Amino acid sequence: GEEDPEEEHELPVDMETINLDRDAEDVDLNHYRIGKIEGFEVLKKVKTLCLRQNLIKCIENLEELQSLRELDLYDNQIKKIENLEALTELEILDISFNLLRNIEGVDKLTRLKKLFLVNNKISKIENLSNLHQLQMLELGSNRIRAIENIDTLTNLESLFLGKNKITKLQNLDALTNLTVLSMQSNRLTKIEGLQNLVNLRELYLSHNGIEVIEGLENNNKLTMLDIASNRIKKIENISHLTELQEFWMNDNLLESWSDLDELKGARSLETVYLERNPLQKDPQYRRKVMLALPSVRQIDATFVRF
């Protein structure tokens, strides 16, 4: 996987794979240097189509495939989502690592379950209104400036917004099934808006500007809380999270060893990351954490086993 001098030179659609997959349900076209989608009419039974890692600049000529459940376009050059209107049973769409600047063309795919747009140029969240069966949505590594227009996706269990420009936590109130939320490497300065997500088990807030832990009062079931790489000086208001299993506080301002008193409520807490806090200047760092938290078996990158 080093350097490929032929990487940019388009090839005809691979003849050997097309004829082997004519009646196959799974068609693997990954890394074939395909530059234009054409001649796919011969795939009669295809349910899953993998176009990963090709030269495709345009979505074309997939309308003929009515049996298609899953479409993988990952790592192509596609600049616009179009010509998917007629694929009405498509349940998984992965367009991640493309040139997309907008979310479009998915309005008529009403059975969509997973949608991965990760690492594109997308600026705004919109045009998702009609995917009512959507379970997982990954918008990470985009330019998105705000959380908008997801109020109608009520079956979302997973929302990954990490590595964006989002400045405020808002408009999640309607998603009561969300079990996982990743807001990381964003512009958040405050924890708010999570009061209605009562099923949240995983929250990733790392690499924000958060100064204070708050607003978690109603998220009881959280087993994974990631607040690392923030401005937090004090551990607060987590005393009622008793199901915590992993806790990442590293790369913060934590000073007082007595803050660990608010973690005693979790007897299942197996992993804690406190590293690169002022606490670690203390030579008794491992001892003081292990003595405060008898349950934890792993501290940072080390196995302690109590």
Coordinates of C-alpha atoms in Angstrom, one line a residue:
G1 CA 0.0 0.0 0.0
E2 CA 2.8 2.5 -0.8
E3 CA 2.8 4.4 -4.2
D4 CA 0.8 3.5 -7.3
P5 CA 1.9 5.3 -10.5
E6 CA -1.2 3.9 -12.4
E7 CA -3.7 4.9 -9.8
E8 CA -5.2 7.8 -11.8
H9 CA -5.5 6.0 -15.2
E10 CA -9.0 4.7 -15.8
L11 CA -9.6 1.1 -16.8
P12 CA -12.6 -0.6 -18.5
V13 CA -15.0 -2.3 -16.1
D14 CA -13.3 -5.5 -15.1
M15 CA -14.4 -8.1 -17.5
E16 CA -13.6 -11.1 -15.3
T17 CA -15.6 -9.9 -12.3
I18 CA -18.6 -8.9 -14.3
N19 CA -19.0 -12.3 -15.9
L20 CA -18.4 -14.2 -12.7
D21 CA -21.0 -12.0 -10.8
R22 CA -23.8 -12.0 -13.5
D23 CA -26.1 -14.1 -11.2
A24 CA -24.3 -13.3 -7.9
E25 CA -25.9 -11.5 -5.0
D26 CA -22.6 -10.0 -3.9
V27 CA -20.6 -8.1 -6.5
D28 CA -17.1 -6.9 -5.4
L29 CA -15.6 -4.3 -7.8
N30 CA -13.3 -2.7 -5.2
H31 CA -10.0 -1.2 -6.4
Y32 CA -10.5 -1.9 -10.1
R33 CA -9.7 1.7 -11.3
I34 CA -13.3 2.1 -12.7
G35 CA -13.8 5.5 -14.0
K36 CA -17.3 5.3 -15.4
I37 CA -20.2 3.1 -14.4
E38 CA -21.5 1.4 -17.5
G39 CA -22.6 -2.1 -18.7
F40 CA -23.9 -3.1 -15.3
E41 CA -27.2 -4.3 -16.9
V42 CA -25.8 -7.8 -17.0
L43 CA -25.9 -8.1 -13.2
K44 CA -29.3 -9.7 -12.8
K45 CA -29.4 -10.8 -9.2
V46 CA -27.1 -8.3 -7.5
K47 CA -28.1 -7.3 -4.0
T48 CA -24.8 -5.8 -2.7
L49 CA -22.6 -3.7 -5.0
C50 CA -19.1 -2.7 -3.9
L51 CA -17.5 0.1 -6.0
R52 CA -15.0 1.1 -3.2
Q53 CA -11.7 2.7 -4.1
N54 CA -12.3 3.6 -7.8
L55 CA -12.0 6.6 -10.1
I56 CA -15.8 7.1 -10.4
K57 CA -16.7 10.8 -11.0
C58 CA -20.5 10.4 -11.5
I59 CA -23.3 8.2 -10.3
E60 CA -24.9 6.7 -13.4
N61 CA -26.5 3.6 -14.8
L62 CA -27.5 2.0 -11.5
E63 CA -31.2 2.4 -12.2
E64 CA -31.5 -1.0 -13.8
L65 CA -30.5 -2.8 -10.6
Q66 CA -33.8 -3.1 -8.7
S67 CA -32.7 -5.8 -6.3
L68 CA -29.9 -3.7 -4.8
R69 CA -30.0 -3.5 -1.0
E70 CA -26.4 -2.1 -0.3
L71 CA -24.3 0.3 -2.4
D72 CA -20.7 1.0 -1.4
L73 CA -19.2 4.0 -3.3
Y74 CA -16.5 4.7 -0.6
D75 CA -13.4 6.5 -1.8
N76 CA -14.5 7.8 -5.2
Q77 CA -14.5 11.2 -6.8
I78 CA -18.3 11.6 -6.9
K79 CA -19.3 15.3 -6.6
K80 CA -23.1 15.0 -6.6
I81 CA -25.6 12.4 -5.4
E82 CA -28.1 11.8 -8.2
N83 CA -29.8 9.0 -10.2
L84 CA -30.6 6.9 -7.1
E85 CA -34.3 7.8 -7.3
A86 CA -35.3 4.4 -8.7
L87 CA -33.5 2.2 -6.1
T88 CA -36.3 2.0 -3.6
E89 CA -35.3 -1.0 -1.5
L90 CA -31.7 0.3 -0.9
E91 CA -31.1 -0.1 2.8
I92 CA -27.4 0.8 3.1
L93 CA -25.7 3.7 1.3
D94 CA -22.0 4.5 1.8
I95 CA -20.8 7.5 -0.2
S96 CA -18.0 8.4 2.3
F97 CA -14.6 9.8 1.2
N98 CA -16.0 11.5 -1.9
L99 CA -16.1 15.1 -3.2
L100 CA -19.8 15.8 -2.1
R101 CA -20.6 19.4 -1.1
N102 CA -24.3 18.7 -0.3
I103 CA -26.8 16.0 0.9
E104 CA -29.2 15.3 -1.9
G105 CA -30.8 12.6 -4.0
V106 CA -31.7 10.3 -1.1
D107 CA -35.1 11.8 -0.6
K108 CA -36.9 8.8 -2.3
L109 CA -35.0 6.0 -0.5
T110 CA -37.4 5.5 2.3
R111 CA -36.1 2.1 3.5
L112 CA -32.6 3.4 4.2
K113 CA -31.2 2.1 7.5
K114 CA -27.5 3.0 7.4
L115 CA -26.1 6.1 5.6
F116 CA -22.4 6.9 5.7
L117 CA -21.3 10.3 4.3
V118 CA -18.1 10.5 6.3
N119 CA -15.2 12.7 5.1
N120 CA -16.8 14.8 2.3
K121 CA -17.1 18.6 1.8
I122 CA -20.7 18.7 3.1
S123 CA -21.5 22.1 4.7
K124 CA -25.2 21.8 5.9
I125 CA -27.5 19.0 7.2
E126 CA -30.6 18.9 5.1
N127 CA -32.8 16.8 2.8
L128 CA -32.9 13.8 5.3
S129 CA -36.6 14.4 6.2
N130 CA -38.1 11.3 4.5
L131 CA -35.8 8.6 5.9
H132 CA -37.9 7.4 8.7
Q133 CA -36.3 4.0 9.1
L134 CA -32.8 5.5 9.4
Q135 CA -30.9 3.9 12.3
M136 CA -27.3 5.0 11.8
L137 CA -26.1 8.3 10.3
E138 CA -22.4 9.2 10.0
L139 CA -21.6 12.8 9.0
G140 CA -18.1 12.9 10.5
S141 CA -15.2 14.8 9.0
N142 CA -17.3 17.4 7.2
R143 CA -17.8 21.2 7.4
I144 CA -21.2 21.1 9.1
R145 CA -21.8 24.2 11.2
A146 CA -25.1 23.3 13.0
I147 CA -27.3 20.4 13.9
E148 CA -30.5 20.8 11.9
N149 CA -33.4 19.0 10.3
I150 CA -33.0 15.6 12.0
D151 CA -36.1 16.1 14.1
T152 CA -38.0 13.6 12.0
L153 CA -35.5 10.7 12.2
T154 CA -36.9 9.0 15.3
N155 CA -35.3 5.6 14.8
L156 CA -31.7 6.9 14.9
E157 CA -29.7 4.9 17.3
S158 CA -26.3 6.3 16.2
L159 CA -25.3 9.9 15.2
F160 CA -21.7 10.6 14.4
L161 CA -21.0 14.3 13.9
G162 CA -17.3 14.3 14.9
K163 CA -14.7 16.5 13.3
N164 CA -17.0 19.3 12.2
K165 CA -17.5 23.0 12.9
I166 CA -20.6 22.5 15.1
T167 CA -20.8 25.2 17.8
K168 CA -23.8 24.1 19.8
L169 CA -25.6 21.0 21.0
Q170 CA -29.3 21.5 20.0
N171 CA -32.1 19.9 18.1
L172 CA -31.5 16.4 19.3
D173 CA -34.6 16.6 21.5
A174 CA -36.8 14.5 19.2
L175 CA -34.4 11.5 18.9
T176 CA -35.2 9.4 21.9
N177 CA -33.8 6.1 20.5
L178 CA -30.2 7.5 20.2
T179 CA -27.8 5.1 21.9
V180 CA -24.6 6.6 20.7
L181 CA -23.6 10.2 20.0
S182 CA -20.2 11.3 18.8
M183 CA -19.6 15.1 18.9
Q184 CA -15.9 15.4 18.8
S185 CA -13.3 17.8 17.3
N186 CA -16.1 20.4 17.2
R187 CA -16.5 23.9 18.5
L188 CA -18.7 23.0 21.5
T189 CA -18.2 25.2 24.5
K190 CA -21.0 23.8 26.7
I191 CA -22.8 20.5 27.4
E192 CA -26.5 21.0 26.8
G193 CA -29.5 19.6 25.0
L194 CA -29.1 15.9 26.0
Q195 CA -32.0 15.9 28.6
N196 CA -34.3 14.0 26.2
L197 CA -31.9 11.2 25.2
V198 CA -32.6 8.7 28.0
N199 CA -31.2 5.7 26.2
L200 CA -27.7 7.2 25.5
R201 CA -25.1 4.7 26.3
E202 CA -22.1 6.3 24.6
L203 CA -21.2 10.0 24.4
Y204 CA -17.9 11.2 22.8
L205 CA -17.2 14.9 23.4
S206 CA -13.4 14.9 23.0
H207 CA -11.5 17.8 21.5
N208 CA -14.0 20.6 22.2
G209 CA -13.8 23.8 24.4
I210 CA -16.0 22.5 27.2
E211 CA -15.1 24.0 30.5
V212 CA -17.7 22.4 32.9
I213 CA -19.4 19.0 33.2
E214 CA -23.1 19.5 33.4
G215 CA -26.4 18.7 31.6
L216 CA -26.0 14.9 32.0
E217 CA -28.7 14.7 34.7
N218 CA -31.1 12.6 32.6
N219 CA -28.6 10.2 30.9
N220 CA -28.5 7.4 33.4
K221 CA -27.7 4.5 31.2
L222 CA -24.3 6.0 29.9
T223 CA -21.7 3.3 30.0
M224 CA -19.1 5.3 28.0
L225 CA -18.4 9.0 28.6
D226 CA -15.6 10.7 26.7
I227 CA -14.9 14.3 27.8
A228 CA -11.1 14.2 27.0
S229 CA -9.1 17.1 25.5
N230 CA -11.2 19.9 27.0
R231 CA -10.7 22.8 29.4
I232 CA -12.4 21.0 32.4
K233 CA -10.8 21.9 35.8
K234 CA -13.2 19.8 38.0
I235 CA -15.1 16.6 37.9
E236 CA -18.8 17.4 38.6
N237 CA -22.4 16.2 38.3
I238 CA -21.6 12.6 37.2
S239 CA -22.3 11.1 40.6
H240 CA -25.6 9.6 39.3
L241 CA -24.0 7.8 36.3
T242 CA -23.6 4.4 38.0
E243 CA -23.4 2.3 34.9
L244 CA -20.2 4.0 33.7
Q245 CA -17.7 1.4 32.3
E246 CA -15.1 3.6 30.5
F247 CA -14.3 7.2 31.4
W248 CA -11.9 9.4 29.4
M249 CA -10.8 12.6 31.1
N250 CA -7.3 12.8 29.7
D251 CA -5.7 16.0 28.4
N252 CA -7.6 18.3 30.8
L253 CA -6.9 20.6 33.7
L254 CA -8.0 18.3 36.5
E255 CA -6.2 19.2 39.7
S256 CA -7.9 17.9 42.9
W257 CA -7.6 14.2 43.7
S258 CA -10.9 14.6 45.6
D259 CA -12.8 14.9 42.3
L260 CA -12.4 11.2 42.0
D261 CA -14.9 11.0 44.9
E262 CA -17.8 11.5 42.4
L263 CA -16.8 8.3 40.6
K264 CA -17.4 5.9 43.5
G265 CA -21.0 5.4 42.4
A266 CA -19.9 3.2 39.5
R267 CA -18.8 -0.2 40.8
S268 CA -18.6 -1.4 37.2
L269 CA -16.1 1.2 36.0
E270 CA -13.3 -0.8 34.4
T271 CA -11.3 1.8 32.5
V272 CA -10.3 5.4 33.3
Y273 CA -8.0 7.8 31.3
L274 CA -6.6 10.6 33.5
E275 CA -3.3 11.1 31.7
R276 CA -1.8 14.5 30.9
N277 CA -3.8 16.2 33.6
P278 CA -2.0 18.1 36.4
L279 CA -2.8 15.0 38.5
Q280 CA -0.1 13.1 36.7
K281 CA 2.6 15.3 38.0
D282 CA 2.0 13.5 41.3
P283 CA 4.3 10.4 41.6
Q284 CA 1.6 8.5 43.4
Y285 CA -0.7 9.0 40.3
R286 CA -1.3 5.2 39.7
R287 CA -1.7 4.5 43.4
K288 CA -4.2 7.4 44.1
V289 CA -6.4 6.4 41.1
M290 CA -6.3 2.7 42.0
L291 CA -7.1 3.5 45.7
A292 CA -9.9 5.9 44.8
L293 CA -11.5 3.5 42.2
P294 CA -11.1 -0.1 43.3
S295 CA -13.1 -1.4 40.3
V296 CA -10.9 -0.1 37.5
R297 CA -8.7 -2.7 35.8
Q298 CA -7.1 -0.3 33.3
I299 CA -5.6 3.1 33.8
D300 CA -4.6 4.9 30.6
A301 CA -2.4 2.4 28.6
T302 CA -1.6 0.2 31.6
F303 CA -3.3 -2.8 33.1
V304 CA -3.6 -2.5 36.8
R305 CA -6.4 -5.0 37.7
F306 CA -7.9 -3.1 40.7

